[PDB]
């Protein structure tokens, strides 16, 4: 119905409410990184730090988790009455973890000979650290009241499709 | 010009204070913070603050006791200890 009009500097409503979709990717970094546990001790403590949040979920029935994706994809990415600064961050956090999932599946598909070896763990520690710090920097960008233009996929993949 | 930047950064201040008010801390903090806020300047201010300085004046009182109970404690500890020869009963039986 509105929005247009379009703001100049976003208030702290959206600054707080738009970085929520970075929660599950923040806590889902270590799912396929157990091979790097032989390399970095902090990955052990990160697991037990994210355990309370993964325990918070589950008491909510699975339909909530299965419908969150559809609600985000066709309640915020549709129609115009929503800030373009906030829906952008929603689509930022909604399929940032799809790349992580794809990497996970291509990792499991590979044989265990090269996964647990000295190459798989060295690949996965770097992947996990880079992904975690990317998520943290996206959170910082959201808190700063500006977009999060990650180099390769952000602009095109997440500005073309969420147009309505 | 400091006023402008301060009024910009206060927005981010409220931003992340509410952000980490709305994390796992938020899930146990429904109970915790709701109790804390529904009588802000009220019951929690007068009940939880007491528990807050309980630890403070606590280790103050322990340091005071260390001041006061360090005079002859070793003497009485040695006297009130049974051995092959000495015992508190023997001491207190005959002056």
């Amino acid at each position: 119905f509105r929005f247009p009009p379009m703001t100049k500097k976003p208030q702290w409503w959206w600054r707080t409410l738009a970085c929520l979709p970075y929660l599950m990717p923040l806590h889902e970094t270590w799912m396929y990184a157990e091979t790097a546990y032989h390399l970095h001790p902090f990955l052990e403590d990160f697991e037990f730090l994210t355990y309370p949040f993964l325990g918070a979920i589950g008491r909510l029935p699975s339909w909530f988790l299965m419908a969150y994706f559809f609600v985000a994809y066709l309640g915020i990415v549709r129609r115009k009455e929503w800030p373009h600064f906030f829906r952008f961050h929603v689509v930022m956090g909604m399929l940032l973890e799809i790349a992580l999932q794809v990497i996970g599946t291509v990792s499991k598909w590979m044989p265990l000979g090269v996964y647990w070896g000295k190459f798989g763990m060295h690949f996965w520690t770097a992947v996990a650290f880079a992904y975690l710090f990317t998520v943290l920097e996206s959170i910082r960008c959201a808190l700063a009241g500006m977009y999060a233009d990650i180099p390769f996929v952000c602009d095109a993949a997440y500005i073309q499709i969420p147009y309505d | 010009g400091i006023a402008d930047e301060t009024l910009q950064v206060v927005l981010a201040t409220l931003g992340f204070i509410f952000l980490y008010t709305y994390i796992i801390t938020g899930e146990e903090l429904v109970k915790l913070a709701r109790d804390y806020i529904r009588f802000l300047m009220g019951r929690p201010k007068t009940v939880r603050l007491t528990r807050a300085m309980d630890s403070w004046n606590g280790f103050l009182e322990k340091m005071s006791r260390q001041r006061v109970y360090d005079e002859y404690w070793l003497e009485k500890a040695i006297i009130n200890t049974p051995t092959w020869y000495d015992s508190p009963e023997k001491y207190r039986r005959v002056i």
């Binding site: 100049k8 690949f123 880079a130 990317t134 233009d149 990650i150 | -």
Partner: protein
């Protein structure tokens, strides 16, 4: 960029994520080069500094007259045990 409209909302500089990824890759390669990253040691050992302090002041006191009382002994009890049990792993 803009495909529906935003006048002046800043766009994040892309070099930050590039720096993060490059640093992660470089850290992985460096760890491959040197796995024993826990062997890195601090510039000073705290107990060594305390021993030097006590030695100097003890010598200065016994040079003239009066005995010397050690300041390390006046440290609270359950910090000395903590250091004694944690130094080999935390402060080598």
């Amino acid at each position: 960029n803009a495909y529906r409209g935003d006048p002046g909302v800043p766009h994040a500089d892309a070099d930050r994520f590039v720096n993060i990824w490059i640093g992660s890759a470089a850290f992985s390669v460096l760890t491959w080069v040197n796995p024993y990253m826990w062997q890195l040691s601090n510039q000073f050992n705290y107990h060594d500094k305390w021993m030097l302090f006590e030695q100097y002041h003890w010598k200065k006191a016994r040079a003239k007259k009066q005995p010397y009382e050690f300041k390390w002994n006046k440290i609270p009890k359950e910090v000395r045990d903590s250091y004694y049990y944690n130094w080999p792993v935390y402060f080598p």
